[PDB]
Subunit: 376 residues, 4 copies
Amino acid sequence: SMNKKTKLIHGGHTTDDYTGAVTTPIYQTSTYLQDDIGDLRQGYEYSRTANPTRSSVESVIAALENGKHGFAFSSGVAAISAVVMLLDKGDHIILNSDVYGGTYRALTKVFTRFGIEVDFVDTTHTDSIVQAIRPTTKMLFIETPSNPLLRVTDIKKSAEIAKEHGLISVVDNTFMTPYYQNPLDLGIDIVLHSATKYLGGHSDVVAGLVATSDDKLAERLAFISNSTGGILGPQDSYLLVRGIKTLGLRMEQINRSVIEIIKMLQAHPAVQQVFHPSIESHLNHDVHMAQADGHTGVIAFEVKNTESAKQLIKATSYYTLAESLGAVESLISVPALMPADIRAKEGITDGLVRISVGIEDTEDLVDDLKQALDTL
Amino acid sequence: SMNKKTKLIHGGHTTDDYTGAVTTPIYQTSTYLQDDIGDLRQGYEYSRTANPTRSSVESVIAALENGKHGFAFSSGVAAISAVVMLLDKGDHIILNSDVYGGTYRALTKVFTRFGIEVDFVDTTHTDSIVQAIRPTTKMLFIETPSNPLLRVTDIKKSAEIAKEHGLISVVDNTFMTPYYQNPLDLGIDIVLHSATKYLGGHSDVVAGLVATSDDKLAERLAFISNSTGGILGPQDSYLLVRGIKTLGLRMEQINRSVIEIIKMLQAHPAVQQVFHPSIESHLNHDVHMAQADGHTGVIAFEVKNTESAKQLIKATSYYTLAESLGAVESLISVPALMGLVRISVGIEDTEDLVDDLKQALDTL
Amino acid sequence: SMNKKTKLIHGGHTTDDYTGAVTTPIYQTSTYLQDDIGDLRQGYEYSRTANPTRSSVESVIAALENGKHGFAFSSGVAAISAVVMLLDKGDHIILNSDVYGGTYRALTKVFTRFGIEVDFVDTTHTDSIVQAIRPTTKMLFIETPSNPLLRVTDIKKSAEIAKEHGLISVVDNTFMTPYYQNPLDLGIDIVLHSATKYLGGHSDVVAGLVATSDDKLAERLAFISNSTGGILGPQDSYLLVRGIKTLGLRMEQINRSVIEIIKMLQAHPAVQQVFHPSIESHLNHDVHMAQADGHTGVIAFEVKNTESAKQLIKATSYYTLAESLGAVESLISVPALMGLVRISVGIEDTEDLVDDLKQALDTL
Amino acid sequence: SMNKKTKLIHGGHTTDDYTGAVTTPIYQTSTYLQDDIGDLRQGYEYSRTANPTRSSVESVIAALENGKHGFAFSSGVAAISAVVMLLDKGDHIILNSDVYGGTYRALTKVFTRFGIEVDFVDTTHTDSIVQAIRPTTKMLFIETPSNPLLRVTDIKKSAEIAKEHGLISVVDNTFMTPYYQNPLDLGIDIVLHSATKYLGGHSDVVAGLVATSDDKLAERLAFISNSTGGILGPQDSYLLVRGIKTLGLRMEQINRSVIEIIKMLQAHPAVQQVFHPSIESHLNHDVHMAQADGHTGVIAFEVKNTESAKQLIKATSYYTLAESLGAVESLISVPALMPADIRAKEGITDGLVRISVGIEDTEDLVDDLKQALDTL
């Protein structure tokens, strides 16, 4: 019963019971000696099946999401990939139309070849999920807020919709992190993250994390992980644990700057509109406040055209033009350039700019972006 | 032009063109700065899609297997699963009946749920491969030698059948390594490895490696890997590059010990049978010699019962009771429990490994 | 131009100009290819003399301390020993009497054997520094605040004395970090850190960092380091760069908890005294506020006897009984045994650390 | 009582007693939890004083050199630096005139300022050591074979000379490695290595290793290491252990190529002379065979002038022009360009070329260097 900032330091198991080392040892090892045949010395026999450094980060994400079983994968895509392989051929899964672009690509071009049929639904309306549910629908996949336009979906209702129809509810909590949003506490079966983003938070790990409280769903995830082998390595597991330590402090510095930056974007004439769940005029803004304690650092705002966005990027000094988000350094991107009907259903327009607020000084970030907008 | 031991040191790109560093830099990084929107400074944009350290080890395995493209995965099992995902629902795969247990598990328990069926066949007689071909068969997947009995399958003839019948041929070359056997040179489309074993060589990396010369197949593997993200990390990529450097020396010490160990086992009163492709009476022995320039370090032999096998392990001093194979240290196991005994010959002193196993067998 | 939190993210060179990678590549390498004999492709020839990952963290500490040159050592003790080796036999050093125990050991037990003598002086009264100056005195070395009582020494006035008397002034800025106190801006010649503590921040790196603006001193430190080889490795260099990124956020959470923890300790019946430079009755409190923009996370308080102190540690839940300080997790110790108690405030929840320490004190 | 190749795999302690992991865990940690105050859980309290990954490589070098105590330092220079700090001001140490250049620089320009007086002696004649021994001489420092001209010194005699006069005998065994030469078995007190070279052997670690069998000399080295802090990190300790595993196989492939390469250099008219202890006409060649089981991979040979050496380097394809030696890749250097009286006493002339034989194919290395010499 510790507070969130305390949970990030002592939640789970990140110490060495053997030597007392206050950080998780990095087990660069493949196999483990057995004193007697079949008798494992500490539960370990082969690192693909289980590795102590990986089990440590798996116990952390489980503790942060108030779950019971954690799983670490080589990438957030590998985590999503392992989750959908819970379904069989002829099975059916519903997602929000505005999922992360890589998620759309994986389910439409990879997993449809295996007999999994996919339906996309603007989940901002809860009952619209029920329109697309079939007697073969087994999974409801929610990504709130979405990438990169931050559409909010009612998690607590989607869980009830999933629970009623015998559906496996999944939430992609990458943008909110366990520090501000806990889908497992709202009835969801499985929560997953792209740990590449906020959790690692230092632009130096590609990883995915999955957590659940259901036993039999966990034994199925462990079976898929051990049989498809998309496991996170020990070195990356350790850097994940290390980065998670400062998640609360990083999110709070990010949230402070998000406040000041939004107030500047909404008052700058060179900006057409701003997209963020903290805005009262934003769609489903009251749903977000009911299910989340804070806000993501991804902000979307549209200038007039793509060429103005390229000029705006070249005018800044602290915003790094690159992919990914949630890092200590602020990142800037043009989602349209980094099919057209799906891109429009994701909210991506020309002149749409996505920023990821870092942990630099607030006034420095506001005045840098504002001075850049003055040139348009 | 470049001999084998030289190719292990200089094959592929394992140096830094920037600073001139003689080893591959470890790029613990997720993303890369772009000078202009879509203008990649060195071709890198996101580490899942491409990472310079991973591209280094990927260029090594393609060079060592005489392939055009290489792919590094987070485990050998992940390399297999990416290859199997080349197919659609309804497709069939033909495999050797004694295929690796993890491959059996992944195909029967996972990929059959997606309509991909597998047909187990004694591939030591190539006629059995043809008779099991269905109109929906799309892939031939073989290991040679297999585990743990080391059964040899004709690679060249398997490549001809897959070619004549329009199948994607796959060879798991883990046990032999690129230092002794190159399936791509024998007509196979895709060769893969559990780099966890010999390639890494030091019992400290879990990894898979895939190589092919087909552009359309590599483009499909690249798309599959980017969309399922079973990516090998940079630090493991580096240790893989580092371990491969001594692959030729390790294999050669392993093969010298295998000769003396088999000679001891064949004569010991407590041993009833020895399994290894280097024995002239082994099935398809000449087939192996025609497709391989050396031997694997995995040896299986039989003793009376599992009790004598367990007492054998405790009586040894230099054989480590653990899973896995292909490491610098010698490994021993009883496959039915994890009287057949399987050993992995390491790079310890040859007479030390001979005397130590013999004195332990003397206690039975 | 660049504020403090921004300088922690973008100060120094912590990106790859080659591929555009946003984090410093880890150069696990020993040597570098030369295009021509003596022609360094990027200025690197041998990793002991210079390593690009180490040069990254070296450029960070110089930027954060407003210095011209930075030096990364394998421990804070190694950073101190390189600085002390600037002197010759017969030279003298003036230090605060309560200097770090490892510094006491290194100077009295090691460097006196080479003729370098040390004069311990209560530097909280700057007059005592002048009266201990000999004709052979060459260096003034101070820590502020000190361990474990947190005694404050006037940095500006110490810099004037060293300047007026021709001494090399050194300040151990470990406890305050570059985020709150910059001795080089106050006239000190050399500032050093045990990066093992706050800079690394995560209890997983042993390192020392040195910064100076003097070219002739930096040239001498560079020669000393290349000829004694107390070099920080590349992997530790990288984790140092990574940990420093959150230094501002960690210190600020630590300082918020320090305020509430001191308020609780000052009122608890079981506490007889609290030591911290943030108390207005602390000796040289206004001196600290004039040379520092914040506070350290080390707090010392006194309870009845060592028994009550030991029972305090067992009664807590979030305080880790271990050596060291400045980590994300809270650390507690009894200095006389490794009733004075020293705690290191971490980044846990403020009320959690307040309530947990109070309920433990309630059991005494 | 295992053979050398077996000793490199199982000598010392490189496994995890806790989990059974067959490789040493990497303890990226600074401090260790204590269950009771002052009571260490497994002997660890602070990583500068002791770290489990470092203790593992320290137990390896001790086992390989038949010593009892090992010490790992941040560089071979830091190892030598810690060894000479065993002496006091006014103390006296004898070295061979042709020591490694960095050793000469460290003792002449650093440790002379602390009262340590240094004497250089052509140790190829044993009694010449006795000419320079004073009532304040405390240490005899031998580097056989030398860098880069490979002058051989009688180890067994130098030990007797040191033992008679109450001297601390030290041998720099970098070039021979513990696989071929074991100074501790010949009476020497302290053996040290630049583990950067052959031991690591993969051009990716800078490290130094020290070993001794005397208890009180070890307690003094541990005191200096803990008080001057030039400790090797855990990641570099691990890569050292990993590289040491293949030391025997790498040395034997190197020795095979050294044989074939020397026979080519001695028969090429473009080569004036060749320097290697395996040559019968080489100085003290019979001393080497009496104290060493094999040969180093460093070979020195002189072409006519410096300009011919630069042309020879540009003609090769498998020889890497860089510093350091003992790596899997073959390295080539010109020691004169990478005072004049000391350089001449070290045997360094113009046109002198130093090669470090790698583990590439023998015929490839011979024909590559030979074809290059044909252009001169």
